[PDB]
Structure formats: structure tokens, C-alpha cells
Amino acid sequence: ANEVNVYSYRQPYLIEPMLKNFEKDTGIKVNIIFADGLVDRVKQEGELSPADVLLTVDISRVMEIVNADLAQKIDSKVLEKNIPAQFRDSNDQWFGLTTRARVIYTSKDRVGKLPAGFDYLDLAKPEYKGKVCVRSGKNSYNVSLFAAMIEHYGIEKTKAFLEGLKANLARKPQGGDRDQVKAIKEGICDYSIGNSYYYGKMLDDEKQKSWAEAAIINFPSGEHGTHKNISGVVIAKHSPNKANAVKLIEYLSGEKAQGLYAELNHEYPVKEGIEPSAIVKGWGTFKSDTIKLEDIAKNYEAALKLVDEVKFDDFSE
């Protein structure tokens, strides 16, 4: 046909606008399934997998796919021009489309703004007992944060951090990132961990704006700064519509789509010269962790093991 088969780890509200604009501008039909491809299914199906494009939200998932030989190399002058080298594979098998920060939200009323020098690590200190909310420790946004911490500190110190963080939780890990900010608004907790773009999404939503208004976005500024991760894309090894798949990822890297990522999603474009939204610009800039993206993913397995050892999500005692 004239189609492309997309498997998306992103829910419709954070990707449909980009894909609909792609369909209108190119004439190529997008078939989309929301993941639950699934890496194990893509592997076992092998040559019969209909997947063209896998849209990811985490570098560690990207490297799981690439390491399993489920991607293929894409050499595109358009991707080269649009995506800075630090946000795509040197070996051409994966491509970053946005960056996002995993930030600390605080209660406007009960905490205020965090001081310069505040670190993720501070959330494990005894004085924050009963005041911290985080979604499941096994959620990959969290595990990739902990993976970066292993690169910086090793597994003993990272485990001690996880034990302290767990000890300080106000409630059993539950919900997603926005839900923790709702909990700040309601008074259940005073500090949460979540991705930056969700603050802008909440502000844009009539039903969630009060959640964001009750919280302050903070970019950690300890030794290794603020954790960054990427939304991205891989073209599957056996892509049945590969030319169309390349046109899709080239489109997502371009000026128009990158502007949509900025203005609609409140994410940081990878493409230089594309301004963030007014909301995102208002937060100011921050010192990013200089860790290489692959060096986050390298530690994912070890981080997941630590989360299991500390039984992070168990709130029984």
C-alpha cells in the first residue's frame, strides 16, 4: 500500500498530533498500535513482524531493542542535519526526537523552590520522611534515573539511596507522574519525581492546571545536574514499508514536527533553532547531566535489580 506501521510507547495525546500532520503533509497512511512490539513479540515473529517504526520514551528501551538486533541502520542526510550527533546512535540504529528532564516537583505552599545544589540524593535523607511521592520504582523513567546514579556512584550507594527514598514515601507507589503532582496539590506529599513536560501538559488542561499551580518545577543542581532522557525512534529490522518509515522519522525530526513537540508536548526539541514553548522557556535552563545516553542504558539491568532487592513498591512496613 502507501502506509507505515507504527508501534508507540506514547499515548495518543502525546503523539497523534505529529502523526496526523505527517499523514496530511505526505499522504502516507499511519497504522498505529499502542505498545503493551512489545519487544518479545517482535523478536519471536522475526521476519514476519509488520512493524516499521517503534516510538520510544526511554533510552533503555531503545538499547534493549537495538541490542537484541531488532533495528536496522538508517543513513539519512535529513536526520544528520536535523538531529545533533549526541542525540542519535553513532551507528545509525536509533534516533532521539526530544529530550525531557526528570525533575523534582515541590509543594508551592509547604516547600517552595529548592535551593541551588539540591540533588535527587537529598530525597533519601531522614528529614524528608513522610513527604515524598514517586510512581512505581520499576517504571522505566525511574529505573533509567537510578541507572545514571549507578554510573556516578556505584550500586552500594545507589541502593542506600533507594532504601532512604523508599523510607520517605508518603504512600505506596501508584499512578503516573501527573498523579504525584495531584497528590502534592491535595497535601499528601511535598516532593515528587516526574518528567518536566507533564508540568506544561497539566497547565494546558482545564482539569489538571490546579495540580500544576500547587507545585513548583525544580531542576536538580547537584554534582551531576538534572537527569535527561529521550523520546526516540527505531526502524525495525524487517520493516515492510521502510522507505515510508524513513520518511516518517525524517518528518518527526524536521522543523514543523519539532515545533509541535515543543508547543503541544512541552518537550525539548532535539533540532537546533526550534524554540521551546513559552511555558517551558519560563522555567529557565539548567545544568544537564553530561552522562552519555548509552551509559544510562548500560546500567538499567543493575538498577532494576536494586529496585527489586529493596522491594521499593512494598508499603507493608
Neighbouring CB atoms inside 10 A of 9's CB total: 20
Q: What is the largest CA-CA distance in the chain?
A: 61
Q: What is the C-alpha separation between 53 and 151, in angstroms, rounded?
A: 30
197 among annotated binding-site residues? yes
Q: Which residues are annotated as a binding site for Fe cation?
A: 197-198
Q: Which residues are annotated as a binding site?
A: 141, 197-198
Q: Which residues are annotated as a binding site for Fe(3+)?
A: 141, 197-198
